[PDB]
Symmetry: C3
Subunit: 337 residues, 3 copies
Amino acid sequence: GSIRLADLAQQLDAELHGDGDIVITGVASMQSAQTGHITFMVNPKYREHLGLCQASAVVMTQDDLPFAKSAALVVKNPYLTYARMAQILDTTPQPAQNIAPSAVIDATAKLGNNVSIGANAVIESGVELGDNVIIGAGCFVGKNSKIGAGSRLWANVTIYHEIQIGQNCLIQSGTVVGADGFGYANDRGNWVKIPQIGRVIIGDRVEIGACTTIDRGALDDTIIGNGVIIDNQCQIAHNVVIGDNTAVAGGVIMAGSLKIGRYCMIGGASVINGHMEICDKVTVTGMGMVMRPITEPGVYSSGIPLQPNKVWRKTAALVMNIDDMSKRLKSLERKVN
Amino acid sequence: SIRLADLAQQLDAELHGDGDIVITGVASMQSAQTGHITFMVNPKYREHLGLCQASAVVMTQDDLPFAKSAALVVKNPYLTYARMAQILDTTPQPAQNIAPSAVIDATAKLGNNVSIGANAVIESGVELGDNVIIGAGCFVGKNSKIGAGSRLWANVTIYHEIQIGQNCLIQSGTVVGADGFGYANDRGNWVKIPQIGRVIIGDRVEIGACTTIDRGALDDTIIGNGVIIDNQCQIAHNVVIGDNTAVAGGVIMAGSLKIGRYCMIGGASVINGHMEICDKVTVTGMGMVMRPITEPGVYSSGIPLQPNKVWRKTAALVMNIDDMSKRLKSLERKV
Amino acid sequence: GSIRLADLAQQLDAELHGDGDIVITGVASMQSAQTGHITFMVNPKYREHLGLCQASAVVMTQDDLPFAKSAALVVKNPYLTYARMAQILDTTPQPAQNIAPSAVIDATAKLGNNVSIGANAVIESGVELGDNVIIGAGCFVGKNSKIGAGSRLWANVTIYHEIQIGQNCLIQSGTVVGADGFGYANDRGNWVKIPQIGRVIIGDRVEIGACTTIDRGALDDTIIGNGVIIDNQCQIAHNVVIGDNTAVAGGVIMAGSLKIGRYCMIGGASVINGHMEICDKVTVTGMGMVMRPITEPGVYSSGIPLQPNKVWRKTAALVMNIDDMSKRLKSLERKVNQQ
Ligand SMILES: CC1(C)CC(=O)c2c(nc3nn(-c4ccccc4)c(O)c3c2-c2cccs2)C1
Ligand SMILES: CC1(C)CC(=O)c2c(nc3nn(-c4ccccc4)c(O)c3c2-c2cccs2)C1
Ligand SMILES: Cc1ccc2c(c1)-c1c(cnn1CC(=O)Nc1ccc3c(c1)OCCO3)CO2
Ligand SMILES: [Mg+2]
Ligand SMILES: [Mg+2]
């Protein structure tokens, strides 16, 4: 939806330098922007490049202003302003509008005001959908689950029974919330299923990527705190607890009964052992092999990275034989001493 | 609800306390309230059984002196817990009866008491055995066969010509029978090899959510009886998994791997193909399996986490370990 | 489906030795093949085994021919001929045929000729489906997305809005194309979503496995080149660009803004970090941990493989303490150097 530059500047708390009557139609990258677009500059190395940008307006700082070759919106934080203006001008559609005649909705489900449910979605008995909730096409929402006001599911999301989802969450397609945890007892080599009768509780303002799986708890619950952001294809096992505002990047695999504190950052493709705790304010870099508890805040890493194959063959063989190398070092130390 | 004495009989457990107590459900020790049965495995909880508010606790004989409530005495509290949770299970079924919005080919062959959820799609020639339950939004492709008692949660995809045994359970988002990753090369251009084998899943197999099991190229991908597979796993074409093996979350297996019986594959392991793992092998988490495993036991890989400042030095030195080796050999020659 | 052996041989450009009137019904492995089946031999150790194979015909080389115990098709490349004959005799069904009454299709969607849309599929406003496109049961195709002629989606594929897919592509079930990239700003310790208003552009002849995710770009686009093959459970982040003919095996994760060249081969379970480039003709072996750009073609690897647990415990402890081993070696060198 188009907006006058002066009105956009007011909504952004930006200082306008230039024509307030310019009409802005959307956001674009600096290299792709054309007339009607607003863009932003975060890297001052691009000052000398601004004459190449065809945007109608550029968000920048006060120090950048002398280098502008366009209307400019001056702010302290161009990146955050970009995020805000991209929300004002967002072109992303809603997953559904109104209630599709092909949706299958149990007579006992409770729908708030202004709820939309897409084609062929399936809502079980006892479900409660808060005001402004949007359920995409093809979703399934299981018995007695509750989805708080303003939350949105994209197409083909699966929510099992007895799940609680807070307000203003966003779940991408293919995600499964509330499948059975991996709970089995062993009887003489045969696995005996343990029914998983806990739940999943997801807080407010949680964003979950695509094809992520969050299993329900065995007895007590799997819990995702407020403001958590989880990328695609993560596995959050039964009885995991993830503290408020933690970020989990793509493809992280967590085992059961892991507790992660608040304010953590878990890098993509990490692997985290279960039945243990990671304290608040921990960053694990990508592909981290988290075998043991983390008890102090800070940054932690693992992994021996890529080498040319010919070199790697020697590295791996020598590491595998490092005990012999250690024994030889000690023997030579003794001989020299 | 069930009387404690009746529950104790079904569990073959020895009752110490009031058999007339009514048990309504299972709970953890910390959450248990009047009416709940709970269990303990670790002796550390003995000291505060007096804070547990369950109506009964499953425990061992050595635990009995510490009991502060009715107690069921058994040899294996964890297994008894599994059985009592089955007796008291509150989990609903994926569907009941056949939904009017399900789309079912007239040539599907349906047993007795089959339930099919809303908007599920059943192709021609599919056979569903007695008591099979197909969740909402599933797809079951042409000529696939699902044995008696098996159940699919919502939004499961089964391709064509797949065979699934009796009493299996498949969680949502899983895909069984997609094409294996098979391509010839005609001068830099990939040429698709149609994948015309199948997947054969035995009896009592449980598969997690968003797991993929690909069909074979000519012969079949095979999942043995009693296998349990967690979420986010990839089982490539022509993999064979032996009975009772367990595969934890996020494991990736390459084509034509054969895994034996009673194996335990830890989470996020990577198992290469065209090789065999014998029976009774455990691979720990993130294991990098490059070679056949011919003896039972526990196997591991990986250099675990360190503080970043320490890791930087560890990785740099490991990357230069050939130079360290050459320097050591030079020093030996000199000495 | 069935075809006379002489006709199959002509279509494969193979030399027939045997009865061209044999009727071939399908392809099978050597171990499983029965009357009516054609099979192939690539490994000459099986020459002595050919009398146990009950196929009606076997594809083989001229050097294998004296060992035959069946009608034979002689070719230079049995494996490639196998791929071609399996295509000729393919038993794989189509994801759908015709337009299902239970599909929900916006009035503004545009269909080419001979499109098939499966049961309970959902097609949004503005979608364009090319000639011969097949959309499987239960799929979702979001607003304004375009799928080129001959492309096929299996059941339960999700395509978001503003996605472009070329011709003759194949996408397996459970895959999600165009979900939001993992983009957030920081407002005084609160995450602020960055709308992901770029797209995904997929070229021609791309095959994508099952439960793979390919996120849309933040402003500009995620791009998959022509002829790319991507296995199951892969994660392609926002703004990744993959060059023509690259192959990505199962379970690979690629972080945002990675650029991969043409003719690359990325082994299963690799982890490729972002904001960097991999040049053409690079092979990364399985489980590779890619932290830096790759500027020269060739083969690259990482990872310390499995050992018995008791051995691994000692290996890991010694590696974690390798700085002390390095210091000890340096001290010993100074002593041997008389310093
Ligand atoms: C949340 C944010 C706005 C900032 C952030 O913290 C983050 C972001 N995207 C990431 N992608 N990958 C990734 C993905 C796949 C493979 C390898 C790496 C990370 O590790 C990512 C991280 C993190 C780095 C270290 C801890 S979390 C976006
Ligand atoms: C594309 C092709 C026809 C040939 C090919 O190169 C390839 C293929 N299938 C693979 N499966 N896995 C795999 C899968 C899961 C776990 C571990 C390994 C690889 O790594 C594979 C590779 C590659 C090897 C090195 C770089 S790509 C089939
Ligand atoms: C996730 C993680 C991360 C880092 C790790 C470990 C685990 C780990 C290491 C050594 N032991 N463990 C625990 C482990 O792998 N247990 C295990 C093994 C096989 C199984 C299983 C559990 O669940 C049932 C299926 O088979 C090395 O670092
Ligand atoms: Mg319908
Ligand atoms: Mg992985």
